[PDB]
């Protein structure tokens, strides 16, 4: 059987890379050398995807075992490693011959801007090459963006094609959905902050705002990007080194979210917007003004996290508008209904509350500080990064807490030493207040020398 594969291979494995050789597609997939090559190309081409690849590897192992069994049966009939040799023959078969780069580069120019260009010439090339931007290979994305920038063509000069020629082109109006979907999927696979910035400003400028489905899923994936992924956001918005490019990106994101919140505040009950959707994140949020809305819980988290980074350098309108509608003055918060059971659901969890108190926007902090449980107060005082003013006022809240109901407080307390150490640390760094909690701690823990 291995000798059969070695004898059948040179018909197509030694031939060039022309299409007719090995009867187009069928006979290619058959011949083990050809097959192996195409399979390795497809194989190289998240956790769920890894499991699929693992299943493919198991299937390949099963096929190799079947081929070995066939070889064993053939040997028995004749009387009456194999995989390594087959792979070596397939690799060393010396196929391909030629793709020389200038020939295919000049050939490709006719398909997009030349008189030969049409819908199909753009759409097929986009379906083949733009899809590579979502692949797990970072080299795939690098080569794809380099090739697109080279073939097609004052901030982010390299990616300026996506910002100044393609949205202006006639072939964008009909092929907007496929590019938008592919780039939106690629927002999770992209890593460099400048790339993420370019895609976000593009989706801010030239998206189908009018279509509800595109706006909704774009909001969902942007919400996943800004909530699920933090380190990309951290490098993009490092508060040690703010930049006006980050200002433009945050203004664009706030513009998109302001548009979404306007759209959902305009949505009334009894429309097609409210469905029994498959996804669990759907939440029916109704404001104190009677307005009704259906949006995803992670999108709410995305809206609130965007306000924790402070004001824009060059803009104040959308930030203030979003701050007012989301965190009003002298008014209560809206009540959310989880669509699964129509019950009240949490709005500001612990990982969210930490970023609200860390944020220096005052309204957000005093909104977070309202009705805090003693366990949550212990969690917040135990964390770092909080500014001095927020820390001091939370310490005064803790002072009120101990003076009112100390019983739950020292019921939940596992150990008093290290918190007393940290609260005196926070007291001496420049904070005022909180001395009552420290004094109560030292009341049962008098100071000791070391």
């Amino acid at each position: 059987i291995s000798t059969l594969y070695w004898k059948a291979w040179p018909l197509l494995l030694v031939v060039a890379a022309f299409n007719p050789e090995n009867i187009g597609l069928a006979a290619w997939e058959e011949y083990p050398t050809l097959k192996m090559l195409m399979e390795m190309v497809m194989t190289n081409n998240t956790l769920t995807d890894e499991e699929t690849r693992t299943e493919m590897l198991n299937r390949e192992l099963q096929t190799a075992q079947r081929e070995k069994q066939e070889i064993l049966a053939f040997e028995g009939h004749l009387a009456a490693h194999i995989l390594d040799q087959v792979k070596s023959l397939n690799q060393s078969l010396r196929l391909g011959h030629l793709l020389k780069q200038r020939q295919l580069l000049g050939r490709l120019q006719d398909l997009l801007l030349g008189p030969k260009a049409d819908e199909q010439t753009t759409c097929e090339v986009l379906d083949y090459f733009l899809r590579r931007l979502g692949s797990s290979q970072v080299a795939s994305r690098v080569l794809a963006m380099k090739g697109l920038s080279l073939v097609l063509s004052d901030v982010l000069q390299g990616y300026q094609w996506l910002l100044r020629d393609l949205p202006r082109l006639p072939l964008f109006d009909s092929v907007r959905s496929t590019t938008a979907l592919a780039l939106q999927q690629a927002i999770h696979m992209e890593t460099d902050p400048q790339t993420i910035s370019a895609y976000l400003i593009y989706l801010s400028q030239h998206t189908p705002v009018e279509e509800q489905a595109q706006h909704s899923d774009l909001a969902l994936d942007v919400a996943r990007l800004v909530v699920e992924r933090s380190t990309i956001m951290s490098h993009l918005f490092s508060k040690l080194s703010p930049s006006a490019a980050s200002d433009a990106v945050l203004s664009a994101l706030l513009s998109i979210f302001s548009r979404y919140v306007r759209r959902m505040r305009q949505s009334k009950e009894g429309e097609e917007v409210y469905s029994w959707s498959e996804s669990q994140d759907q939440v029916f949020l109704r404001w104190s003004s009677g307005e009704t809305a259906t949006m995803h819980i992670l999108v709410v988290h995305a809206m609130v996290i965007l306000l924790t980074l402070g004001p824009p350098r060059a803009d104040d309108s959308e930030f203030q508008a979003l701050l007012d509608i989301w965190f009003p003055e002298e008014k209560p918060l809206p009540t959310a209904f989880l669509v699964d059971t129509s019950e009240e659901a949490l709005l500001l969890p612990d990982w969210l509350k930490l970023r609200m108190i860390r944020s220096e926007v005052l309204r957000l902090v005093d909104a977070a500080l309202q009705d805090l449980e003693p366990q949550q107060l212990l969690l917040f005082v135990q964390s770092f990064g909080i500014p001095v003013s927020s820390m001091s006022k939370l310490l005064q809240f803790l002072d009120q807490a101990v003076a009112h109901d100390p019983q739950t407080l020292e019921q939940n307390i596992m150990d008093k030493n290290y918190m007393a150490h940290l609260v005196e640390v926070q007291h001496e760094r420049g904070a005022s207040g909180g001395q009552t909690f420290h004094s109560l701690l030292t009341a049962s823990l008098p100071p000791r020398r070391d």
Binding site: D192, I232, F384, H421, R429, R449, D450
Partner: protein, 210 residues
């Protein structure tokens, strides 16, 4: 691509904490892992001088929010990690997306597995300089600080992971010079032994080899 300043390493080596308050936060983010390790665990020192110095250390790093990620990294049960890694070692003898989409134990498991894999490959060979061990965590700029911090803990808390083999492995990886520099910054007294271990491998310039 910022390395630890000589003042920072000298001050950490001498534990000159009074001048450590005069160090910039971008500099301090490289030596922070060990720092948070110091102020949050078993002192094993029990001195009033060290009690105040630990107090000043806790004072200094309270103003940076990146310490919360390390606290999450420091709160795991490391016994499960050492058993899993040792069992895998006996068994054999788009990872940044997973990094963004996982908890601290999974991060530690994946990077510890990667690290043990590269030192096993290099120890199996005779110093062939397999410089293409992997480039998935070392290449993207986003996961430089986070994985560097996590590498400091995974080279400290499972202390059965040797410092010299970690240094040689980082020499084999793409962008490991910066990791080696900050890792020696975190564990300061190993500089002599790290350099000693790094000297006994190559003889000549190897015709200016890679």
């Amino acid at each position: 691509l910022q390395f630890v300043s000589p003042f920072a390493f000298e001050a950490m080596q001498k534990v000159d904490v009074v001048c450590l308050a005069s160090l910039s936060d971008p500099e301090l983010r490289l030596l922070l892992p060990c720092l948070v390790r110091m102020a949050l665990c078993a002192p094993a020192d029990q001195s009033q001088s060290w009690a105040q110095d630990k107090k000043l250390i806790l004072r200094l790093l309270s103003g940076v929010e990146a310490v919360n990620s390390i606290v999450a990294l420091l709160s795991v049960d490391f016994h499960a990690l050492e058993q899993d890694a040792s069992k895998e070692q006996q068994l054999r003898h788009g990872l940044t997306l997973e990094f963004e989409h996982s908890d601290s134990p999974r991060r530690l498991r994946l990077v510890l597995s990667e690290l043990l894999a590269i030192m096993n490959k290099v120890s199996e060979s005779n110093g062939e300089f397999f410089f293409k061990s992997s480039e998935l965590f070392e290449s993207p700029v986003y996961l430089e600080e986070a994985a560097d911090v996590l590498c400091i803990l995974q080279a400290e808390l499972p202390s059965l992971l040797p410092i010299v083999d970690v240094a040689e492995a980082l020499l084999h990886v793409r962008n490991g010079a910066w990791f080696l520099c900050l890792l020696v910054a975190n564990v300061p007294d190993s500089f002599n032994e790290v350099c000693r271990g790094l000297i006994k491998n190559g003889e000549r310039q190897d015709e200016e080899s890679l």
